[PDB]
Amino acid sequence: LQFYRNLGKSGLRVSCLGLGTWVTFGGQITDEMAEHLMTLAYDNGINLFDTAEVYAAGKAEVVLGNIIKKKGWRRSSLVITTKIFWGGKAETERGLSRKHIIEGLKASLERLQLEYVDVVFANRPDPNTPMEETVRAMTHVINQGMAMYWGTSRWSSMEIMEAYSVARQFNLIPPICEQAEYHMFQREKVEVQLPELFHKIGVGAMTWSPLACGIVSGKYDSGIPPYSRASLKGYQWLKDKILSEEGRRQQAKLKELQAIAERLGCTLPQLAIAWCLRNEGVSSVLLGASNAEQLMENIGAIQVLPKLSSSIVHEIDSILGNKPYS
Template sequence: MVWFVIDSKLHTGQGRCSKIISIYSVFVQFTLSELCWLCFLYTVVLQFVFVMLYIFVLIETVRAMTYVINQGMAMYWGTSRWTSMEIMEAYSVARQFNQIPPICEQAEYHMFQREKVEVHLPELFHKIGIGAMAWSPLACGIISGKYNNGIPPYSRASLKGYQWLKDKILNEEGHRQQAKLKELQAVAERIDCTLPQLAIAWCLRNEGVNSVLLGASRTDQLLENIRAIQVLPKLSLSIVSEVDCILGNKPCNKKDIRS
């Protein structure tokens, strides 16, 4: 099975450093044959096709995605939850057999989940231009501040099937995260933005992050999150350093280890 995403995007900036916020995303799951039949019945062009799990013969995956793009069913393809080695292998196979390589890895990235995007993906970004599409920039709503005083009624963590999220919020690590979020709230107020806006802008400040995927249940919430793009210029080195100091979880990259 393959995940497909239809995105509407908000662009800002120019050239390689431009950033994108995905303001509307629809994820659907098809087999390749189902996708071909869908495109036969309707005029469908997807911006991105994501292969979520590396469970196929790699050359077949690369050829299948090349076929999808050459047939006009999609514009690009990317990977989701692949390791850096698997992504590099896919790129090498595509170049070797004159196929289309992936251009993006969809990875979880937020203030409490940093290692993959900040340690493992930068090398791919600089070597072969693989960008990152960050999902869950608010950590399933944890960074929104809504859980500061427990689990509100009708919130995601209160719903059936989300016991894992409730446990994550209420355990010892969750309490430590809530304490850090209160400190980050003060930083957000100082630069005249909300905590979610600070968190989203913090994700976008990473040069290897090309896009963040946003989810919203209300129009005003969506508009608030989109305005995070206006916060990005306010993230000076001193602000970023202060955020890192509060979080206390900045991973050591390979250059730091070698030096």
């Protein structure tokens, strides 16, 4: 219904759909495609773009940066996020130490050709760095105006709660967002644990992989298509998931869901993406796309949203059989 929404309880307003740059930018797709993909997302009102130092060893950032600079879009109209954790081969080039958060963000910001990102994320938790150091560094880079806000990714509730608690202890800035995985086959965290953090400390969920890497598109029904992600060099891990006992158990479930899709008169991907947004707990879904067809289709998930009755939902829940007890 509402295309824009507060990221958690922060005053930051995001389109309910964002465009990511994992696998694709500076990697799988060309820069021409990337530009086209961004221009499309932007012209349809998407203001949220997610990247990371790790993606294509910085190249995703270079490309995203170039597009922004080429199109001459007003910075105030964009919400750019980047994630920090893996920034190089040297020992001190990874993690959430003050040294890496600073050096990492600075390197990212340079590649992006931006003075700041809107949200900077801890890309995963760091058992080797005290919370206090991490929260201080995040608070430092915001105060340096290198970020507007900060967020966590793949942290547990306790980890997020701890970060928040430490911020209140030392009068620092709490995180506003957790970037968590969410699709029909990965629900536990976003559906049980995150809403409690949202109500308690106002942290919002910005979710990733709504098509579970393309799996939910159904395209893997008969195996590994050429030019699919599972087919790419260095995605054997995914190919293995897809062709596993559990991977197949899933594709069987897709066939049933496909029935529900044709009934609402939409594609399966649209249903799945729309399914992720079905609850106000989720602030935005980060899309992935290797072409303009995939993206324009995915944007269509929004039209599906009011078609998701509580009965269509209970129906999907039955076929999936993976609704987590709260």
